[PDB]
Design a protein around this ligand. Structure first.
Ligand SMILES: Nc1ncnc2c1ncn2[C@@H]1O[C@H](COP(=O)(O)OP(=O)(O)OP(=O)(O)O)[C@@H](O)[C@H]1O
Ligand SMILES: Nc1ncnc2c1ncn2[C@@H]1O[C@H](COP(=O)(O)OP(=O)(O)OP(=O)(O)O)[C@@H](O)[C@H]1O
Ligand SMILES: O=P(O)(O)OC[C@H]1O[C@H](OP(=O)(O)OP(=O)(O)O)[C@H](O)[C@@H]1O
Ligand SMILES: O=P(O)(O)OC[C@H]1O[C@H](OP(=O)(O)OP(=O)(O)O)[C@H](O)[C@@H]1O
Lengths: 377, 206, 368, 206
């Protein structure tokens, strides 16, 4: 038996993951994202530079026997992209993509994976929300190309709005912890009561009770809040991004400005992509620090396997007894034909014996009247 | 079944009123019944009677859409994968350490016996004390009397049960009350059914 | 910044690895090998079942917090294929391929990688050397498809010859001496059947006459020396491959059940390809693996087409004009052109080759 | 107490060990099933009885808060039993550990097992080479399959009546189960003089 959150991916699932991993990688590359392939392991000094407590706890530690120094098995590739951008990126716009195995000490969600195949894209060096719209464009090209029946819905949030309501209203760590717990738990009554006590409290209850309706939200906020340009611009970014997703990609967009997870990592707009009614987001993206401006997304490619189908494979057996009756020149000719079928992606087995049977056989390649041809089983 | 499944476990006795005023009065009286699933006056709501210990499990996996769980259970189980919508302010008790009456601290690392293992490890961690924890399933009052543990972590209302068993309350860990928890999918997909019942409860506790 | 034997693969090298890993995988799949993707981690119970001391020492251990049990980060995928074949394989011929990251505690050889990208193929359930000839043919089609200037030289060994000399007549002593080609020390230490043991070392290379040099008694060995000759000739006749023989190549003494292949690129110390017979009912098995990352140095792709849309021109476009340029750009990406929709006038892709420019209601590619 | 402490569970075990104890010279003073006391004297003033939840008997014994106990093999297998001696099979409380799902419903995908017997479940389905998600339950498990929390449950069954009465059917046999006499490893070395007669009488009785 394997450890919880660890599974084999076998046979057609493995072929399908191979095809996904590859198609999505070339898509990102054709959109001008540079593929980087950082290693599974690094010294913790680099791997967890500016890490959260969640990321440190999620990273398996191992000892470098060469030096005695602590190393980690990466639980997230994103920090490695930072290290790479810092070294090679320059001061102008830079684009990176990646696909790589990451390992988590504990599962994300109930019976969730600890070995997600992490695929992602990041844009460094652009302030404009234009870069966030570009990531959305690349993401949605990728998703549409998978010809899934599953629908992706996108939650937009903006940590800036709450971070500002918290600053302008001089909230205590204590208080901020309270509201975040209450938001995270959709506790409207508990929040309504607590806000009657807190300064600019009406604003904090408004984000919860009226955040979904982004088009009117600024109008519902206090004079103080509506005055602050960070809040005005933040509510603007959500509007620009929301419309773009509906108009350009016919994407169902919900808005939740009380979506404050990754509070420490997120510096602005946040996009979460949900497949069907599945609890854990398939895609986690948004603005983060590098004074280097940066935005990005990532997904576990392995979570797409359930919602993607390939055309049935053609699995082909050359007739053992017929092939052995052939003269040399007849064999060169049948090999030239088999080479052609493999070019076309047919899975062809030169049999070692009369009993050699490929798994899920569909066709034999058989001799009849000086002609080799495929015959369904 | 296209409607809401409610996970209940004292709590059945104290939620009846909240449910009555929400429009969900149970047909049978569970205490004397063999049925696992229970219909109600509202044909869009059914009730599962579980052991309190299991309510957060059924909800979190979506075998129930919402449940009434003690904060004692939620803290021990971990409420990471459910929404805590409201504090019902019923079954008001507290989580406490308890040892033998007038018995002194031993000259060795403290041994806690309890069903509330994660609560124990967590509490004594915040007190910066190193404890050996022993998992129990049944009644814990015996554990100190036969020296399985020096202390127990249990829920206490008045104190009568501890005293009746020769034990005395030591340290207050935290306050406890029944909390209304909701499955994350159910909250998004069945909110139309939930909102009236939630608004009625919010009303009822005021 | 990174630990010894740990490197980034960046930019065109990363794209090239992605292309290699993929081309070689689909080649193996088109030859009827089933792709399996086992996980990076298992409990040590399964991951190191029947492991050598080399394998155990090379595997990082980590703690499963859910259960308190020991897990390992795999240093080799091959054992996972065994576990997979045992479960799903049945008793007939079965073929598997795989590509996956593996992690080593210490480097393989001098300046070796600790993060090899391991690609391999294995055949289970065939006694016939025919299955070894199939692996050789698949491996060499894969290598020829890379259009490298680099030459592969193949060392053949056969552990059975020594395993028999050992049975028909210390073991750790000779293997140390052999492993180091320490001839004088070996000659001395030869004084049961000692002459035979020194002969394997001193006359192993000349396989055609080796049987004749062995003690009458010693003359499994007959067939073993036959297998080497069949495989040697096949590689020379069919692939025009320089083949050397070393019957004292007992590196994998614990895993290897018969014929062993090592494939060297140019004059590089560590083999690029490690193959041969291993056990997996008495289920027969043979296979190979290579570090795909070690091919990067000896492979070249066509230069990429890297394309910038003109910022100024794109912004002047009405909605319908933008829909049309997007349809065109979508087509260029379908063709594998790398196209950037610029966020600013200064947005410049690395290694630009072409701009897409507007002139008289028409967008066209122009070399820089 | 300078003498032996015996860990029993109320109901079935207590009911079926009473005769074995009577013929060993340990007849209880009071009748527990109607009593509030935790520790119970007996005809022998060198033997006392602790009445625990079956789930806890192996804990009290293993830590030496009881010198010996009567535990179901179901409990021992689930709990571990690494740290106690299993001296004899009493051949009382004869039931079996089994998988159970809905009647005539077939196995679907990766199985989800809901049970008290998590370690038994992980162990069994491992030897079947079947990959399972396991869900811990504390209370009665018959509801779990009916609301789709799990596809199967692992439970003890004697006849089958409880499963059928709940719409469930016994699926796979895991192993046979009976009450086993377990001893604390220190107690067996230090109090053998007291133990030998009681052990010899039980061996005789069965
Ligand atoms: N004395 C008490 N006063 C108030 N609330 C209590 C008290 N004891 C327990 N509770 C609350 O009720 C919950 C337990 O319910 P109850 O005591 O009716 O069942 P239980 O003893 O847990 O039963 P079971 O053995 O089936 O688990 C606790 O989680 C707590 O929130
Ligand atoms: N139907 C049965 N027939 C025989 N032995 C049984 C049966 N069911 C359970 N047992 C055995 O007896 C033990 C059950 O003890 P008991 O009847 O006290 O159950 P419990 O879960 O401890 O609590 P409860 O008092 O609620 O039943 C198990 O460990 C098992 O070995
Ligand atoms: O009288 P107090 O000290 O304030 O506390 C009353 C006790 O009763 C509760 O269990 P419950 O009433 O459910 O008992 P039961 O488990 O035997 O039903 C709980 O275990 C408390 O310890
Ligand atoms: O083979 P069967 O006749 O179906 O019996 C099996 C039942 O026996 C046990 O209950 P127990 O007799 O201990 O009753 P309780 O747990 O409900 O008190 C156990 O919890 C099973 O549900």
């Amino acid at each position: 038996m394997l450890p919880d959150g660890v599974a084999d991916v076998l046979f057609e699932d493995a072929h399908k993951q191979e095809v996904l991993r590859h198609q999505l990688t070339q898509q990102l590359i054709t959109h001008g994202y540079q593929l980087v392939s950082p290693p599974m392991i690094e010294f913790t000094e680099s791997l967890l530079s500016g890490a959260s407590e969640d990321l440190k706890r999620q990273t398996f530690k191992i000892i470098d026997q060469l030096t005695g120094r602590l190393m980690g098995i990466r639980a997230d590739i994103t920090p490695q992209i930072l290290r790479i951008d810092a070294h090679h990126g320059g001061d102008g716009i830079a684009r990176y993509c990646y696909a790589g195995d990451v390992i988590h000490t504990l599962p994300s969600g109930l019976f969730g994976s600890r070995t997600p195949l992490q695929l992602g894209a990041e844009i460094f060096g652009c302030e404009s929300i234009a870069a966030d719209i570009e990531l959305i464009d690349v993401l949605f090209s990728m998703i549409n190309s998978l010809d899934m029946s599953a629908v992706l819905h996108v939650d937009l949030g903006h940590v800036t709005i709450f971070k500002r309501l918290a600053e302008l209203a001089a909230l205590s760590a204590s208080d901020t912890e309270q509201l975040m717990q209450l938001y995270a738990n959709k506790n409207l009554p508990e929040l309504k009561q607590v806000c009657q006590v807190l300064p600019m409290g009406s604003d904090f209850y408004t984000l919860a009770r009226f955040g979904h309706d982004i088009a009117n939200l600024l109008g519902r906020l206090s004079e103080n809040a509506q005055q602050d340009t960070k809040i005005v611009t933040a509510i603007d970014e959500l509007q620009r991004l929301k419309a773009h997703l509906q108009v350009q990609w016919q994407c169902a967009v919900s808005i939740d400005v009380t979506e404050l997870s990754g509070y420490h990592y997120h510096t602005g707009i946040v996009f979460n992509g949900y497949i069907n009614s599945e609890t854990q987001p398939l895609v986690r993206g948004g603005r983060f620090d590098g004074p280097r401006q940066a935005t990005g997304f990532s997904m576990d490619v392995s979570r797409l396997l359930a919602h993607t189908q390939l055309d049935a494979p053609f699995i082909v057996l050359i007739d053992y007894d017929a092939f052995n009756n052939l003269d040399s020149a007849q064999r060169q000719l049948l090999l030239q034909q088999v080479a052609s079928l493999r070019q076309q992606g047919y899975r062809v087995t030169m049999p070692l014996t009369a009993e050699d049977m490929p798994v899920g056989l569909t066709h034999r390649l058989s001799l009849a009247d000086n002609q080799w041809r495929l015959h369904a089983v | 079944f296209l409607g809401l499944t409610l996970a209940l476990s004292r709590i059945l006795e104290e939620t009846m009123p909240l449910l009555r005023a929400a429009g969900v009065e149970l047909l049978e009286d569970p205490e004397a019944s063999a049925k696992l699933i229970f219909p109600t006056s509202n044909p869009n709501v059914r009730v599962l009677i579980l052991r309190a210990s299991d309510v957060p499990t059924y909800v979190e996996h979506g075998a129930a859409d919402f449940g009434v769980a003690g904060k004692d259970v939620l803290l021990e189980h971990g409420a990471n994968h459910v929404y805590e919508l409201l504090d019902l302010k019923i079954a008001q008790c507290k989580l406490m350490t308890a040892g033998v009456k007038d018995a002194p601290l031993p000259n060795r690392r403290l041994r806690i016996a309890t069903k509330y293992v994660n609560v124990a490890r967590a509490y004594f961690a915040s007190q910066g004390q190193q404890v050996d924890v022993i998992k129990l399933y049944g009644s814990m009052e015996l554990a100190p009397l036969v020296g399985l543990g020096d202390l127990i972590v249990d829920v206490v209302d008045t104190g009568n049960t501890l005293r009746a068993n020769g034990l005395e309350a030591r340290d207050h860990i935290c306050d406890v009350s029944s909390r209304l928890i909701v499955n994350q999918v159910s909250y998004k997909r069945k909110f139309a059914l939930l909102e009236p019942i939630l608004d009625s409860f919010k009303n009822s506790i005021n």
